[PDB]
Amino acid sequence: GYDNREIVMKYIHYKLSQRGYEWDEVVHLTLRQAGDDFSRRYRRDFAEMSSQLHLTPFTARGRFATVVEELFRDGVNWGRIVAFFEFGGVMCVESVNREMSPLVDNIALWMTEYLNRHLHTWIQDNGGWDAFVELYGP
């Protein structure tokens, strides 16, 4: 069984716990190893994109809508997906850090919707999660 919401709400544990939070997922072992290596490799490219959203006047929701639009602009792929989850986590880290913990619930909700209303067709088409783990699995 695979749940986009169960993973989206639990996958935000390693991104927050590192600073101070709760929760935990079981399949994170995959997205994690793939995410950690990403942040390190594309640390600058990622940070540069993060600052951009901070410069814009948009709100918490707006930013997420702008970061998701640019990410999946020239198509989709396991790679872009690994980055999408990365941004989501960071977005929460800033909230809790900027006295906006409650926002964490919002960001977690959005990531769940988009995943179940945008990347639900592509994923299933690319062997779904089954393939995601088969490629870059523990």
Ligand X SMILES: COC1(Cc2ccccc2)CCN(c2ccc(C(=O)NS(=O)(=O)c3ccc(NC(C)(C)CSc4ccccc4)c([N+](=O)[O-])c3)cc2)CC1
How many Cβ atoms are within 10 Å of 95's Cβ, its own excluded? 19
Nearer to ligand X, 48 or 99 (CB): 48
User: What span, in angstroms and rounded, lies between the C-alpha atoms of 106 and 90?
Assistant: 14
Nearer to ligand X, 49 or 109 (CB): 49
82 counts as binding ligand X under rule CB under 6 A: yes
Segment interacting with ligand X, rule: CB under 6 A, options 1-9, 34-42, 106-114, 122-130: 34-42
Contacting residue, 8, 67, 103, 115, with ligand X by CB under 6 A: 67
Segment interacting with ligand X, rule: CB under 6 A, options 3-11, 82-90, 98-106, 112-120: 82-90
How many Cβ atoms are within 10 Å of 130's Cβ, its own excluded? 11
Nearer to ligand X, 22 or 46 (CB): 46
Segment interacting with ligand X, rule: CB under 6 A, options 10-18, 39-47, 99-107, 115-123: 39-47
User: What span, in angstroms and rounded, lies between the C-alpha atoms of 119 and 113?
Assistant: 10
Contacting residue, 2, 18, 24, 79, with ligand X by CB under 6 A: 79
Tracing tokens 């986009």 back to the chain, one arrives at 4
User: What span, in angstroms and rounded, lies between the C-alpha atoms of 67 and 74?
Assistant: 13
CA 98 to chain centre: 19
User: What span, in angstroms and rounded, lies between the C-alpha atoms of 50 and 61?
Assistant: 14
Contacts to ligand X by CB under 6 A: 33-34, 37-38, 41-42, 45-46, 49, 67, 70-71, 77-80, 82-84, 86-87, 136
